[model samples]
Target chain A: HHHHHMQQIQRDIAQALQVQPPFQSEADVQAQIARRIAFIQQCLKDSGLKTLVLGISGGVDSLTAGLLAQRAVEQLREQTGDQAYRFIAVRLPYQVQQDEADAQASLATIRADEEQTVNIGPSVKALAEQLEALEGLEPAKSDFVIGNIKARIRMVAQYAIAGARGGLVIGTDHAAEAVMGFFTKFGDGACDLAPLSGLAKHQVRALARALGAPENLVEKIHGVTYAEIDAFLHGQPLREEAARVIVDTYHKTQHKRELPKAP
Target chain B: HHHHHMQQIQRDIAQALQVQPPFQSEADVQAQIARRIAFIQQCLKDSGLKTLVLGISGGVDSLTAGLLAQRAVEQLREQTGDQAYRFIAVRLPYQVQQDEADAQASLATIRADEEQTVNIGPSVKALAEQLEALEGLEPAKSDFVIGNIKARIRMVAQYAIAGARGGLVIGTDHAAEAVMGFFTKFGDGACDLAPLSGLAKHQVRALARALGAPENLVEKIHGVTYAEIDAFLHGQPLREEAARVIVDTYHKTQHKRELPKAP
Candidate 1:
């Protein structure tokens, strides 16, 4: 069932892109990007949404989205002639050490109409303490819980900022992540608008290039840190292994994404 | 698709009630009610729920539901312990005049383990003014928005009280109401449990009598209101008519009560 569902979703994406499987050329990819941008524009108009807010993590996916959003906003302004649209760039870092580099990169590349930064470490720590106190359990140092906390905190921060600015929270999720359900519910997946949702990672990179993103911004990404923890424990490059596992899981469980029919 | 979905839901409800229609005898009705109560008890236990909170309107359906919930709590307590169950009654009124009589009736007969009342007139008026200002329209008469506001206010009050008391919001909705989709979405219909949802109006009244509720409570409800809104507007007693129309509309609407398939 899972595999069938994923296949259906993939088929829907392919149909929306007007491309058959084994997406043959750059034209196919560009067409998909154009379709996605058009869909996002239509959604904004239909929903009476005026602005897009996004979190830039200095990663390939988000940096790519930042560039696409900048272009989309420009196009929207030209079409609407209202200039009511605003793009807000937010930098949310989980740790003190990662904050400087991530924030600087996000601030430098994102030509957002407005920007803000928030440190989630304190809140995450407080929540962890509260959870421990309630359960009478020892404090957990595992990165999984901490990572999820960081993601959820970032999501809340995005929505809060969006509400304050009267903008829609935009996501940087791509097709691959969505297909595998890799993103957390109501966390990284919580967005009022998702422009890159139909594009795969490869297609997202193409869109970034088309949108004239800087090569460094387009290519560099923070390595999966949690996977490194597992690698250190098991003496293997666990990040690559984990990605492969996800890819396999997506293939095996694709049926789960199929649309239900009336019984 | 919508009709099919509704049929499925109705079938599920009938199956859950464990009754084949037309229920030919009083024994059949009793059996179905008992099955539903048992199912509700099991659902509460599975959810780790200890208490049931209900907004008692002193209407026939609610009064009937209050009795069933009281009985359910008693049965659960006997099976588990005294600490295992509770029933909290909440009353919210837009104005003292609109709800005082009904509220008093509910309070008097139900004998709520705990009860609280909130007046919502000031907030409703404030909100109407704000909306009027934003829309650049004349403020609507209080009568226009009162019913919806009162329903929503009551819902919010019940949820707030439930959260504070660590209980689930219980509902007294019956088949006629559920079918017609008469109650406001996210208002009276937004309950954690609906104990009397499968029965019709007359059936609910009969069950209330069978459950050993005060005779005056039942008689007062039967005598006070008819079910027609126009009649009520003309100073005829017609609360039941108003409720029936709303429920009938819901039954006709395709999107009213479609449920997701089992996980």
Candidate 2:
């Protein structure tokens, strides 16, 4: 059933495009990626914008973004002698454990000229306390609330850093997220510039590999954070079903991600 | 076990955020939306662009976009004149049943000066046949392939129209899809003016209600075309599992939709 379903979806997607798959081979994907990269380079060149600030999350998405930004910067440097490109890797660590590994990996993989980390624990704690006081209730433990608060806090921090540095915030989102609406609003999902806004995960992986991403980084444990959380908290395998639920929510809610039209 | 697992995952998210349960309240959500809207409006004003062209999908998001664009156009008109704000509602139908209904609803709700519908079936079909012949695929019935072709065709048409008409393609994508990376690259997902880029579905629905959106639109059977296709093709509840794989793939792939760093 799953195979049939997937085939149907692929067929539908192809039909929607009114053609067979545009991706006939690896060469096709490469050509498409190259075209996109060239378009971005041309835009930067024409605009004469200097300094591209990208937030690296030690994830596949951000890694690809950092690489794209690096390429764009290199092209700009080569074309315009005076135009300087800077990749500022800002780490907004909301929690210690989450940041300890992810932040380190991000820093190691991306050759960032400047690195800044802002621990959001204090602000999040303050907000939680404030909310508790206003509600007149005993402070209860809830991960979802805190997670959202942290995400929003990170966004605020990123914007401030971007403004201060006078650089565009390069994003690290892919096609899957865009379709499914799987981001926090006004949070980490926010950005000033998105160089890899068009690529999908499979395509992104291909691009990363083509761009020579480290095997260790690329082939890391799938859902490592989730797995760690599962092991630490539940001492079991991650609930694949729940993970699927979140993803399903994204697919069913694609329209939620786009602008509204008059209907 | 499932419940416990979910709770653990929730706890991990909370830990990451350093906050407890009972996340941001309705008031907090409203405040955030207001702030985001203001920021985007400021960005538009700073960009100094005169006309904003939106592709109204006749969905809640698009309706919300129409309202936002209308408001932005009003503000721009106030500053300049009526001619300064031009809202062109383009209805690009691709063998979809609800296109007319959506277009009609959009027209009734928004203050659109110009509206036009360009049937994209013939052009898309022609393109599809050409490609299929080139690929030499045996004739097989696949809706997904056709659907994507139509979407891409519509996108190209809209962009051309926007360019010829001298306006920016205002998009309706919100935060959820951005995070999930669920957009068609360089297709319908492509745009110039993204007014609802930072809004989540829940928040967007609230905003739509606050903005006086039509009741039917606010509570309608509206979702992405892919979801509709899944239902039509599989005759199932539109399994969340399938959606998640796509969503996760996207979230882990794209770069432009990554969460912004802290200030």
Candidate 3:
């Protein structure tokens, strides 16, 4: 089994996505949170941007990112004595999100300086209709395609807000999603900065708890579970099938992680 | 003037955007088109993708890209005798584009294997209303913001088509716009492959003629003209004001050209 090559491959991807090893103690978790919040604040200070913006989807990733952003701006206001610093938590739902209550609860927990909701349905519908008219699409495949459209439309809304407010958009991607390339390219994948870049799924949940988040927040290509994903990311061995699934996905979606090709 | 620093700076940026030295002859222009078409065909074959999808803005860039795509797929079918190869030309207008006639003319010239139009107005209007409801945005600023929303919505439409068709999305960006960072990040900037990567404005127009196309097509950040932009991109010096404008814009929007920041 070419263990040496696998070892180097695993380590290289982990380093590339900036993943961290398991936390030894609760204090280390707290330090990671502090470092992350500081990273957000530092980005604001460095860019001289007035606000931080992100979509709140009631998931652990967005929940954690939203919390860090809120606290960072809170600290920034105190440090600079400038109340102009604020975090805007956006809810970009396509029609009514199935998890409206969960999203609302997440918003309540984060208590961002400003909260906004943009229903992406009309825009998605408008575009989807045009696409269908052009081709005889099967429902199953078209549904998957439409899902990506929704993801992209949400990002468009977020960026529009960011541009108008002169703020930086924050992404929710961590190494768990990054390794599998689970997110949509140029959709959830497009952002000015990612504060939760290296943390695995468990690491994200750990940070969410550390920030006093209520435990209410919760893909395929998921022949591998996050447990196995975290294991792979942290240099632990996975079952052969799990390893195959993870490695294959990481290779297949490689294009999503890089800049567009040029020639 | 700091001639030495400016010389190195200009040269570095030009090379970084992959701008080429100017065309010396008509034959060279023809070679460039052949190379770009081959590049497109190569990408499709390499990715195992069957179709090439692009938003036909009816501009010279899109018109040229559309022609190249049609020709590439045409050549691929002949070479392999596989009729599966095709090019999709998409029209993504926000409400009604002002230059419908120009776009129609451009589309006719490209004569792609398929054509589709998606009106992005409803989607844009829907999202814009939500954004306004959240903040008391000034009309002046909101209109500017809405313009970006339109660009991003157009991209969403194109990607949706590409995804459903199992195709790669083509981009119209070339060195002229690339040098000044003129395209929206993750909006129009999102694509599967960029064929016109290093060519300047005139280079694109030259290719249009080479493709047997009817003529018609045509940004800002343009404290400099494309003449000036292309000249500078080809390593020519600029007037002090033009240099300052181009360099400042390139630096300010550097984030657009890079992967999201991770910390």
lDDT top scorer: 3
Which has the higher lDDT value, candidate number 1 or candidate number 2? 1
Q: What is the C-alpha lDDT of each candidate?
A: 0.56, 0.53, 0.84
- Could you give the candidate ranking by TM-score, starting with the highest? 3, 1, 2
List ranges where model 2 is wrong by over 4 Å. Answer: A1-26, A42-48, A96-99, A132-141, A221-252, A260-263, B1-263
Candidate 2 lDDT over residue span A3-90, tens digit each: 4664455444323222213256878867766765675565444434565665566677777777766776676677767545666677
What are the per-residue Cα lDDT tens digits for candidate 1 across B1-263? 86466445545544433223445688976886687668667756755677777777767778777776777778888888766588777665534563568668767777766665554444344333322212332235334234544464455445444544456677666655555456653347556667776565556666767766566666554122223422322222445545345434533532334421110
Model 2 C-alpha lDDT per residue in residues B49-144, reported as the tens digit of each score: 455666677778877877766666666677766565566777665444675586578668886767766665555444434331124332342344
Between candidates 1 and 3, name the one with more favorable TM-score: 3
Residue A87, model 1, lDDT: 72
Which candidate, 2 or 3, has the higher DockQ? 3
In angstroms, the error of model 3 at B121 is 1.6
Q: Which stretches of candidate 3 lie above 4 Å from their native place?
A: A94-98, A133-135, A218-221, B94-98, B133-135, B215-221
Q: DockQ values for all predictions? A: 0.07, 0.02, 0.66
Runs in model 1 lying further than 4 Å from the true structure: A1-263, B1-22, B96-99, B122-126, B129-146, B214-252, B259-263
Tens-digit lDDT track of model 3 for B103-175 = 7878878888998878777777777776754367878887778888888888888888888888999998898
Candidate 2 lDDT (Cα, 0 to 1):
0.53
